[PDB]
Amino acid sequence: GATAVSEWTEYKTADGKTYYYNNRTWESTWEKPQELK
């Protein structure tokens, strides 16, 4: 579930694209999480 915030980790591609990985649903989206907005 949630580690009480910070469940979304940023991962950058060499070209500088930031996709946010959420450990709650194992989701990797280019959308910016509300817990990190």
From Swiss-Prot:
Induction of synthesis: Up-regulated in brain tissue from patients with Huntington disease.
Subcellular location: Nucleus
Disulfide bond residue pairs: none
UniProt superkingdom: Eukaryota
Tissues showing expression: Detected in brain neurons.
Domain WW intervals: 2-35
Domain notes: The FF domains bind the phosphorylated C-terminus of the largest subunit of RNA polymerase II, probably mediate interaction with HTATSF1 and preferentially bind peptides with the consensus sequence [DE](2-5)-[FWY]-[DE](2-5). The WW domains bind Pro-rich domains.
The protein's assembly and partners: Binds formin. Interacts (via the second WW domain) with TREX1 (via proline-rich region). Binds RNA polymerase II, HD and SF1.
Function field: Transcription factor that binds RNA polymerase II and inhibits the elongation of transcripts from target promoters. Regulates transcription elongation in a TATA box-dependent manner. Necessary for TAT-dependent activation of the human immunodeficiency virus type 1 (HIV-1) promoter.
Identification of the protein by name: Transcription elongation regulator 1
Species: Homo sapiens
Span of the entire protein shown here: 428 to 464 of 1098
